[PDB]
């Protein structure tokens, strides 16, 4: 069917059902970007959503952090199989003597939690927290989705090149990817484009600052820049190091059921059913530890995959999925944190129609 009717017919009922004030949708098909914009960025002002509206993308940020980490590895800052304490002198002698950088990146260090404990909320206390942490599971055996885990990976990866994370992201990675309207901290000059998010009580909210927030869930961007990053994941040509870095993000390290964990990106064998894609993105996988299917060696996952990432903040809900072999992708950025199941069902419906 026609593209506008396909997208509208799936997105509009969902926006009504979940009272989502605004959504920017971007689709890749036939080598071209297409933008579908709904509703408002700011309920009070009535500013309309466009592909230039800045949304909080939450944990979709982890795909950019993972790309930065891979870039630092390609540039020689570390090897993925290095022990974490080789790259954090303050962790020498801790449990991180027995955890690799790859395990940190892929949530398999041994039971680091979803969030930092409440008062682990300064750099000093963060260091003490990791230095004193007692593993729950042997390294590499269990996947427990974790902000502290990938957060530390990003932080250490940037330090391995001698820079803070925010500097390496903003001055090197984003410009090299051609993302010039993507930010960790939205500058005053771009504030007019920044949406508000909406809480369950319909109050306007924005992201909460926090330890390793930048690395784990801190990016603000619009659908056009985010789709440009997806395009770089479909086939990128340019900086050899950045090309290699993106390839590393498509390497699989272990699996949990039908989901294979990469750096940032999670993927599925394609074609993939709605049921499987939902399950891989459900709480049984995202909010509890699971034993992994170990890989003999990390594997390039290739083009016949659906790669995806969910992300949220208090006021925002994002999802991205792409299928390189079919030249199709979707970005959906909303200013309500609405259920992941709805995001996945809508994206799967649209992608299925894009592949006919
Ligand atoms: B990520 O998976 O979206 C990540 N995001 C955050 O920690 C930022 C949020 C602040 C309030 C709601 S999300 C994350 C999200 C969740 C979650 O949705 O319960 C859990 C762990 C990490
Ligand atoms: Zn178009
Ligand atoms: Zn405190
Ligand atoms: Zn940091
Ligand atoms: Zn540090
Ligand atoms: Zn720039």
Q: Which domains does the chain have, with CATH numbers?
A: 1-356 (3.40.710.10)
State the SS3 of 211-243: CCHHHHHCCEECHHHHHHHHHHHHCCCCCHHHH
For the chain, count helices (H), then strands (E): 13, 15
Residues near 61 by beta carbon (within 8 Å), at least 6 away in sequence: 214, 215, 216, 217, 218, 219, 311
Query: Which ligand 1 atom sits nearest the alpha carbon of residue 311?
Result: 3
The Cα 212–Cα 151 span in angstroms is 5
Determine the Cα–Cα distance for residues 159 and 179; give it in Å rounded to an integer: 22
Strand partners, 220: 56, 183
Cβ–Cβ contacts within 10 Å for residue 184, how many? 18
Q: How many CA atoms lie within 13 A of 34 on its CB side?
A: 19
Instruction: Report whether 356 belongs to an annotated binding site.
Output: yes
- Ligand 1 atom closest to the CA of 114, numbered from 1: 21
The residues facing 217 across adjacent strands are none
Expressed in angstroms and rounded, the spacing between residue 5 Cα and the centre of ligand 6 is 35
CA of 122 to the centre of ligand 3 (A): 7
Residues with a beta carbon under 5 angstroms from ion ligand 4: 155, 165
Residues with beta carbon inside 6 Å of ligand 1?
Answer: 58-59, 114, 147, 217, 311-314, 337
d(CA 17, CA 318): 17
Indicate the DSSP class of residue 282. S
Q: Please, are residues 198 and 204 in contact by the beta-carbon 8 Å criterion?
A: yes
Alpha helices, H only, 52-200 = 61-74, 101-105, 123-132, 147-159, 165-168, 174-177
Distance CA 251, CA 106 (A): 11
- Going by DSSP bridges, is the β-strand pair 251-256/259-261 parallel, antiparallel, or unpaired? antiparallel
Q: How many CB atoms lie within 10 A of CB 9?
A: 14
Q: Report helix angle 61-74 to 240-249, nearest 10.
A: 130
Nearest CA to ligand 1 atom 9: 313
CA proximity to 312, closest of 150, 211, 188, 199:
199
User: What angle do helix axes 147-159 and 123-132 make, rounded to 10 degrees?
Assistant: 110
Backbone angles phi, psi at 293, to 5 degrees: -80, 110
User: Residue 188: what are its φ and ψ, rounded to 5°?
Assistant: -60, -35
For this experimental structure, what is the resolution in angstroms? 1.4
Structural contact between residues 309 and 113, judged by C-beta atoms closer than 8 angstroms: no
Catalytic residues, by residue number, are 59
Q: Which residues contact 20 (CB under 8 A, 6 or more apart)?
A: 14, 39, 317, 334, 335, 336, 338
Which ligand is in closest contact with the Cα of 182?
6
How far apart CA 216 and CA 59 sit, in angstroms, is 6
274 is annotated as contributing to ligand binding: no
Choose among 327, 328, 319: nearest CA to 347.
319
Give the HSE-up count for residue 343: Cα atoms under 13 Å, Cβ half-sphere: 29
Q: Ligand 5 centre and the CA of 96: distance in Å? A: 14
Best of 220, 284, 286, 312 for a ligand 1 pocket test (most atoms within 8 Å of beta carbon): 312
CB 147 within 8 A of CB 217: yes
Look up residue 349 and give its DSSP letter. H
């Amino acid at each position: 069917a026609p593209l506008t009717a396909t997208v509208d017919g799936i997105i509009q009922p969902m926006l009504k059902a979940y009272r989502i004030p605004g959504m920017a949708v971007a689709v890749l098909k036939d080598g071209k970007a297409h933008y579908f914009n709904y509703g408002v960025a700011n309920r009070e002002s009535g500013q309309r959503v466009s592909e230039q509206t800045l949304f909080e993308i939450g944990s979709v940020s982890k795909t950019l952090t993972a790309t930065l980490g891979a870039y630092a590895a390609v540039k020689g800052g570390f090897e993925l199989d290095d022990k974490v304490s080789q790259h954090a002198p303050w962790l020498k002698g801790s449990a991180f003597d027995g955890v690799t950088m790859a395990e940190l990146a892929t949530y398999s260090a041994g039971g680091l939690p979803l969030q930092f404990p409440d008062e682990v909320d300064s750099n000093d206390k963060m260091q003490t927290y990791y230095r004193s942490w007692s593993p729950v599971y042997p390294a590499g055996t269990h996947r427990q989705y974790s902000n502290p885990s990938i957060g530390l990976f990003g932080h250490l990866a940037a330090n391995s090149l001698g820079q803070p994370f925010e500097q390496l992201m903003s001055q090197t990675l984003l410009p090299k990817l051609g993302l010039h309207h993507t930010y960790i901290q939205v500058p005053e000059s771009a504030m007019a484009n920044y949406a508000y998010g909406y809480s369950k009580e319909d109050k306007p909210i924005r992201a909460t600052p926090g330890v390793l927030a930048a690395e784990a869930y801190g990016i603000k961007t619009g659908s056009a820049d985010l789709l440009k990053f997806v395009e770089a994941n479909m086939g990128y040509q340019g900086d050899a190091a950045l090309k290699s870095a993106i390839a590393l993000t498509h390497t699989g390290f272990h699996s949990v059921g039908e989901m294979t964990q990469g750096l940032g990106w999670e993927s599925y064998d394609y074609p993939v059913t709605e049921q499987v894609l939902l399950a891989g993105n459900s709480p049984a996988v995202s909010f509890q530890a699971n034993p992994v299917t170990r890989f003999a060696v990390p594997k390039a996952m290739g083009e016949q995959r659906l790669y995806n990432k969910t992300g949220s903040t208090g006021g925002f809900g994002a999802y991205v999925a792409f299928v390189p072999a079919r030249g199709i992708a979707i970005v959906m950025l909303a200013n309500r944190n609405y259920p992941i199941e709805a995001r996945v069902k809508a994206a799967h419906a649209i992608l299925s129609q894009l592949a006919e």
